[PDB]
Amino acid sequence: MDINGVLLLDKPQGMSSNDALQKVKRIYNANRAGHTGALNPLATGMLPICLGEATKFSQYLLDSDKRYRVIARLGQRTDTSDADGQIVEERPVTFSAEQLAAALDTFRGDIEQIPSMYSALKYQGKKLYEYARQGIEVPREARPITVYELLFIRHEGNELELEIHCSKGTYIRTIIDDLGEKLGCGAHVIYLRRLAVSKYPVERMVTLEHLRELVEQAEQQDIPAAELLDPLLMPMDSPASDYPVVNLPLTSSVYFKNGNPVRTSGAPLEGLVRVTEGENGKFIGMGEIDDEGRVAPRRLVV
Protein backbone atom coordinates (compact mmCIF):
# COMPACT_ATOMS: atom_id res chain seq x y z
CA MET A 1 0.00 0.00 0.00
CA ASP A 2 2.43 2.68 -1.23
CA ILE A 3 1.59 6.12 0.18
CA ASN A 4 0.48 8.79 -2.33
CA GLY A 5 0.04 12.49 -1.61
CA VAL A 6 1.67 15.89 -1.06
CA LEU A 7 3.46 16.96 2.12
CA LEU A 8 3.93 20.69 2.70
CA LEU A 9 7.13 20.62 4.75
CA ASP A 10 8.77 23.71 6.27
CA LYS A 11 12.43 23.33 5.32
CA PRO A 12 14.95 23.68 8.16
CA GLN A 13 17.73 26.25 7.73
CA GLY A 14 21.19 25.25 6.54
CA MET A 15 19.81 22.07 4.97
CA SER A 16 19.90 21.26 1.26
CA SER A 17 16.49 20.71 -0.29
CA ASN A 18 17.40 17.15 -1.31
CA ASP A 19 18.40 16.34 2.26
CA ALA A 20 15.04 17.52 3.57
CA LEU A 21 13.35 15.41 0.89
CA GLN A 22 15.26 12.23 1.78
CA LYS A 23 14.50 12.58 5.50
CA VAL A 24 10.82 13.02 4.66
CA LYS A 25 10.97 10.12 2.19
CA ARG A 26 12.44 7.88 4.89
CA ILE A 27 10.03 9.09 7.54
CA TYR A 28 6.99 8.16 5.45
CA ASN A 29 8.64 5.00 4.16
CA ALA A 30 7.55 6.03 0.65
CA ASN A 31 8.94 4.07 -2.30
CA ARG A 32 9.19 7.23 -4.44
CA ALA A 33 9.53 10.93 -3.58
CA GLY A 34 10.35 14.25 -5.23
CA HIS A 35 10.15 17.94 -4.42
CA THR A 36 8.48 20.61 -6.59
CA GLY A 37 11.11 23.37 -6.49
CA ALA A 38 14.23 23.99 -4.42
CA LEU A 39 15.06 26.27 -1.50
CA ASN A 40 18.70 27.15 -0.74
CA PRO A 41 20.25 25.82 2.53
CA LEU A 42 20.20 29.34 4.01
CA ALA A 43 16.50 29.71 3.21
CA THR A 44 13.50 28.12 4.89
CA GLY A 45 9.82 27.87 4.01
CA MET A 46 7.31 25.81 2.03
CA LEU A 47 8.87 22.92 0.10
CA PRO A 48 6.17 20.62 -1.38
CA ILE A 49 7.16 16.96 -1.30
CA CYS A 50 5.32 14.71 -3.74
CA LEU A 51 5.07 11.10 -2.55
CA GLY A 52 4.38 7.95 -4.52
CA GLU A 53 1.89 8.49 -7.33
CA ALA A 54 1.99 12.25 -6.74
CA THR A 55 5.49 12.68 -8.20
CA LYS A 56 3.84 12.11 -11.57
CA PHE A 57 2.12 15.50 -11.60
CA SER A 58 4.92 17.49 -9.97
CA GLN A 59 5.55 19.57 -13.08
CA TYR A 60 2.46 21.70 -12.37
CA LEU A 61 3.84 22.98 -9.05
CA LEU A 62 7.31 23.20 -10.49
CA ASP A 63 5.76 25.76 -12.81
CA SER A 64 3.54 27.66 -10.39
CA ASP A 65 4.09 30.92 -8.51
CA LYS A 66 5.91 31.39 -5.20
CA ARG A 67 5.79 34.16 -2.61
CA TYR A 68 8.92 34.99 -0.59
CA ARG A 69 10.07 37.02 2.39
CA VAL A 70 13.62 38.31 2.05
CA ILE A 71 16.02 40.57 3.93
CA ALA A 72 19.13 41.81 2.18
CA ARG A 73 22.35 43.25 3.57
CA LEU A 74 23.10 46.50 1.75
CA GLY A 75 26.69 47.60 1.18
CA GLN A 76 28.14 44.13 0.63
CA ARG A 77 28.24 41.86 -2.39
CA THR A 78 28.94 38.14 -2.22
CA ASP A 79 30.02 35.74 -4.95
CA THR A 80 26.86 33.68 -4.44
CA SER A 81 24.53 36.64 -3.92
CA ASP A 82 23.65 35.31 -0.46
CA ALA A 83 25.05 35.14 3.09
CA ASP A 84 26.44 31.69 2.32
CA GLY A 85 29.37 33.09 0.36
CA GLN A 86 32.54 35.14 0.32
CA ILE A 87 32.32 38.94 0.16
CA VAL A 88 33.78 40.39 -3.06
CA GLU A 89 32.72 44.04 -2.73
CA GLU A 90 32.03 46.41 0.14
CA ARG A 91 30.90 49.98 -0.50
CA PRO A 92 28.99 52.73 1.40
CA VAL A 93 25.20 52.76 1.38
CA THR A 94 24.36 56.27 0.23
CA PHE A 95 21.21 56.09 -1.86
CA SER A 96 18.31 58.50 -1.32
CA ALA A 97 14.85 57.24 -0.35
CA GLU A 98 13.58 58.21 -3.79
CA GLN A 99 16.37 56.34 -5.50
CA LEU A 100 15.20 53.25 -3.62
CA ALA A 101 11.62 53.55 -4.83
CA ALA A 102 12.56 53.94 -8.50
CA ALA A 103 14.71 50.82 -8.33
CA LEU A 104 12.28 48.60 -6.44
CA ASP A 105 9.90 49.53 -9.23
CA THR A 106 12.18 48.45 -12.11
CA PHE A 107 11.70 44.85 -10.96
CA ARG A 108 7.91 44.94 -11.23
CA GLY A 109 5.89 43.22 -13.93
CA ASP A 110 7.56 41.28 -16.73
CA ILE A 111 11.35 41.22 -16.63
CA GLU A 112 14.46 39.42 -17.89
CA GLN A 113 16.86 37.82 -15.41
CA ILE A 114 20.36 36.40 -15.63
CA PRO A 115 20.57 33.80 -12.80
CA SER A 116 23.54 33.40 -10.47
CA MET A 117 26.41 31.16 -11.56
CA TYR A 118 25.64 29.46 -8.25
CA SER A 119 22.47 27.70 -9.36
CA ALA A 120 21.26 24.28 -10.56
CA LEU A 121 20.53 25.52 -14.07
CA LYS A 122 22.18 23.07 -16.47
CA TYR A 123 24.91 23.92 -18.97
CA GLN A 124 26.37 21.30 -21.31
CA GLY A 125 25.40 18.49 -18.95
CA LYS A 126 26.60 20.05 -15.69
CA LYS A 127 25.10 22.26 -12.97
CA LEU A 128 26.19 25.91 -13.15
CA TYR A 129 27.55 25.85 -9.61
CA GLU A 130 29.87 23.00 -10.63
CA TYR A 131 31.55 25.44 -12.98
CA ALA A 132 31.43 28.09 -10.27
CA ARG A 133 33.15 26.02 -7.58
CA GLN A 134 35.87 25.27 -10.16
CA GLY A 135 36.38 28.94 -10.89
CA ILE A 136 34.85 28.94 -14.35
CA GLU A 137 32.23 31.13 -15.96
CA VAL A 138 29.86 30.16 -18.76
CA PRO A 139 27.65 32.35 -20.98
CA ARG A 140 24.12 32.71 -19.63
CA GLU A 141 20.91 33.69 -21.39
CA ALA A 142 18.50 36.12 -19.74
CA ARG A 143 15.34 34.29 -18.64
CA PRO A 144 11.87 35.89 -18.59
CA ILE A 145 10.29 35.98 -15.13
CA THR A 146 7.25 37.83 -13.77
CA VAL A 147 7.13 39.81 -10.54
CA TYR A 148 3.44 39.94 -9.56
CA GLU A 149 3.92 42.08 -6.44
CA LEU A 150 6.85 43.70 -4.62
CA LEU A 151 6.42 44.83 -1.01
CA PHE A 152 8.64 47.35 0.73
CA ILE A 153 8.47 46.02 4.28
CA ARG A 154 11.14 48.35 5.65
CA HIS A 155 14.64 49.84 5.50
CA GLU A 156 16.59 50.06 8.74
CA GLY A 157 20.32 50.66 8.77
CA ASN A 158 22.04 48.30 6.36
CA GLU A 159 18.91 46.18 6.06
CA LEU A 160 16.16 46.19 3.44
CA GLU A 161 13.30 43.71 3.76
CA LEU A 162 10.81 42.78 1.05
CA GLU A 163 8.08 40.30 0.26
CA ILE A 164 7.67 39.30 -3.39
CA HIS A 165 5.23 37.22 -5.45
CA CYS A 166 6.82 35.81 -8.63
CA SER A 167 6.63 33.20 -11.41
CA LYS A 168 8.52 29.90 -11.41
CA GLY A 169 12.27 30.00 -11.79
CA THR A 170 12.75 33.35 -10.10
CA TYR A 171 16.00 33.92 -8.24
CA ILE A 172 15.06 36.63 -5.72
CA ARG A 173 18.73 36.23 -4.85
CA THR A 174 19.61 37.81 -8.21
CA ILE A 175 17.10 40.64 -7.86
CA ILE A 176 18.86 41.67 -4.65
CA ASP A 177 22.31 41.43 -6.23
CA ASP A 178 20.94 43.32 -9.22
CA LEU A 179 19.19 45.94 -7.13
CA GLY A 180 22.37 46.24 -5.07
CA GLU A 181 24.07 47.52 -8.19
CA LYS A 182 21.31 49.89 -9.24
CA LEU A 183 21.59 51.56 -5.84
CA GLY A 184 25.37 51.85 -5.92
CA CYS A 185 26.39 49.85 -2.83
CA GLY A 186 25.99 46.15 -3.60
CA ALA A 187 23.84 43.66 -1.71
CA HIS A 188 23.56 39.98 -0.78
CA VAL A 189 20.71 38.01 0.81
CA ILE A 190 20.83 37.25 4.56
CA TYR A 191 17.25 36.05 5.22
CA LEU A 192 14.99 34.01 2.94
CA ARG A 193 11.64 32.32 3.50
CA ARG A 194 9.19 30.95 0.97
CA LEU A 195 5.75 31.71 2.32
CA ALA A 196 3.67 29.86 -0.24
CA VAL A 197 3.77 27.81 -3.44
CA SER A 198 0.73 28.23 -5.70
CA LYS A 199 -2.59 28.52 -3.80
CA TYR A 200 -1.36 26.29 -0.97
CA PRO A 201 -2.50 26.97 2.66
CA VAL A 202 0.53 27.83 4.80
CA GLU A 203 -1.66 26.47 7.61
CA ARG A 204 -0.91 22.95 6.40
CA MET A 205 2.85 23.33 6.58
CA VAL A 206 4.70 21.20 9.15
CA THR A 207 8.27 21.31 10.37
CA LEU A 208 10.72 18.45 10.19
CA GLU A 209 10.90 18.30 13.98
CA HIS A 210 7.10 18.21 14.19
CA LEU A 211 7.07 15.13 11.97
CA ARG A 212 9.71 13.57 14.19
CA GLU A 213 7.53 14.32 17.19
CA LEU A 214 4.53 12.52 15.70
CA VAL A 215 6.69 9.51 14.89
CA GLU A 216 7.88 9.55 18.50
CA GLN A 217 4.31 9.98 19.79
CA ALA A 218 3.42 6.92 17.69
CA GLU A 219 5.76 4.32 19.18
CA GLN A 220 4.81 5.77 22.55
CA GLN A 221 1.07 5.26 22.10
CA ASP A 222 1.78 1.97 20.29
CA ILE A 223 0.05 2.85 17.01
CA PRO A 224 1.24 2.98 13.33
CA ALA A 225 3.12 6.14 12.35
CA ALA A 226 0.77 6.25 9.38
CA GLU A 227 -2.27 6.90 11.56
CA LEU A 228 -0.65 10.22 12.42
CA LEU A 229 1.48 11.07 9.39
CA ASP A 230 -1.06 10.27 6.66
CA PRO A 231 -3.63 12.93 7.60
CA LEU A 232 -1.01 15.66 7.11
CA LEU A 233 -0.92 14.94 3.38
CA MET A 234 -2.78 16.79 0.63
CA PRO A 235 -4.59 14.69 -2.05
CA MET A 236 -2.32 13.37 -4.85
CA ASP A 237 -4.15 15.33 -7.53
CA SER A 238 -3.69 18.65 -5.70
CA PRO A 239 -0.78 19.58 -7.99
CA ALA A 240 -3.27 19.76 -10.87
CA SER A 241 -6.08 21.38 -8.89
CA ASP A 242 -5.59 24.36 -11.21
CA TYR A 243 -7.40 22.36 -13.91
CA PRO A 244 -11.03 21.46 -14.79
CA VAL A 245 -12.16 18.08 -13.51
CA VAL A 246 -14.06 15.52 -15.58
CA ASN A 247 -15.78 12.35 -14.47
CA LEU A 248 -16.35 9.23 -16.54
CA PRO A 249 -18.79 6.40 -15.88
CA LEU A 250 -17.11 3.09 -14.98
CA THR A 251 -18.07 2.07 -18.55
CA SER A 252 -16.18 4.89 -20.29
CA SER A 253 -13.08 4.71 -18.07
CA VAL A 254 -12.14 1.08 -18.67
CA TYR A 255 -11.28 2.18 -22.21
CA PHE A 256 -9.53 5.31 -21.03
CA LYS A 257 -7.30 3.18 -18.83
CA ASN A 258 -6.11 1.26 -21.90
CA GLY A 259 -4.87 4.43 -23.54
CA ASN A 260 -8.11 4.93 -25.44
CA PRO A 261 -9.38 8.50 -26.02
CA VAL A 262 -13.05 8.70 -25.00
CA ARG A 263 -16.03 11.06 -25.24
CA THR A 264 -17.88 12.67 -22.34
CA SER A 265 -20.40 15.41 -21.51
CA GLY A 266 -18.84 18.28 -19.57
CA ALA A 267 -15.57 18.05 -21.45
CA PRO A 268 -13.59 21.29 -21.98
CA LEU A 269 -12.97 22.35 -25.58
CA GLU A 270 -9.22 22.13 -24.99
CA GLY A 271 -6.33 21.85 -22.54
CA LEU A 272 -5.49 19.48 -19.70
CA VAL A 273 -7.99 18.07 -17.22
CA ARG A 274 -8.18 15.73 -14.27
CA VAL A 275 -10.09 12.53 -14.83
CA THR A 276 -12.30 10.83 -12.26
CA GLU A 277 -14.39 7.65 -12.13
CA GLY A 278 -18.13 7.25 -11.63
CA GLU A 279 -19.47 7.42 -8.08
CA ASN A 280 -16.73 8.37 -5.62
CA GLY A 281 -15.42 10.72 -8.29
CA LYS A 282 -12.18 8.82 -7.78
CA PHE A 283 -9.15 10.36 -9.44
CA ILE A 284 -7.43 8.19 -12.05
CA GLY A 285 -5.10 10.65 -13.75
CA MET A 286 -4.52 13.48 -16.24
CA GLY A 287 -6.18 13.72 -19.63
CA GLU A 288 -6.11 16.18 -22.52
CA ILE A 289 -8.67 17.11 -25.18
CA ASP A 290 -7.47 16.12 -28.66
CA ASP A 291 -8.44 17.30 -32.14
CA GLU A 292 -11.50 15.03 -32.19
CA GLY A 293 -12.73 16.61 -28.96
CA ARG A 294 -12.36 13.33 -27.09
CA VAL A 295 -10.58 13.08 -23.73
CA ALA A 296 -7.20 11.45 -24.35
CA PRO A 297 -5.26 9.98 -21.41
CA ARG A 298 -1.85 11.57 -20.81
CA ARG A 299 -0.65 10.31 -17.43
CA LEU A 300 -2.47 7.80 -15.25
CA VAL A 301 -2.39 6.52 -11.67
CA VAL A 302 -1.59 2.82 -11.28
Added chain:
RNA sequence: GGCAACGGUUCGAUCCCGUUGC
Protein backbone atom coordinates in the same frame (compact mmCIF):
# COMPACT_ATOMS: atom_id res chain seq x y z
C1' G B 1 10.15 -0.03 -14.79
C1' G B 2 15.58 0.45 -16.82
C1' C B 3 20.01 2.85 -19.28
C1' A B 4 21.96 7.22 -21.95
C1' A B 5 21.99 12.61 -23.81
C1' C B 6 19.91 17.20 -22.85
C1' G B 7 16.95 20.58 -20.11
C1' G B 8 13.83 21.98 -15.57
C1' U B 9 13.34 23.53 -10.17
C1' U B 10 16.08 29.69 -6.38
C1' C B 11 22.85 26.22 -5.04
C1' G B 12 25.99 20.24 -2.58
C1' A B 13 18.25 16.23 -6.71
C1' U B 14 22.95 10.19 -9.34
C1' C B 15 17.82 10.34 -6.42
C1' C B 16 11.99 14.32 -8.60
C1' C B 17 9.93 16.13 -13.36
C1' G B 18 10.12 16.83 -18.91
C1' U B 19 12.08 16.20 -24.27
C1' U B 20 14.80 12.87 -27.22
C1' G B 21 17.57 8.05 -28.18
C1' C B 22 18.17 2.84 -26.85
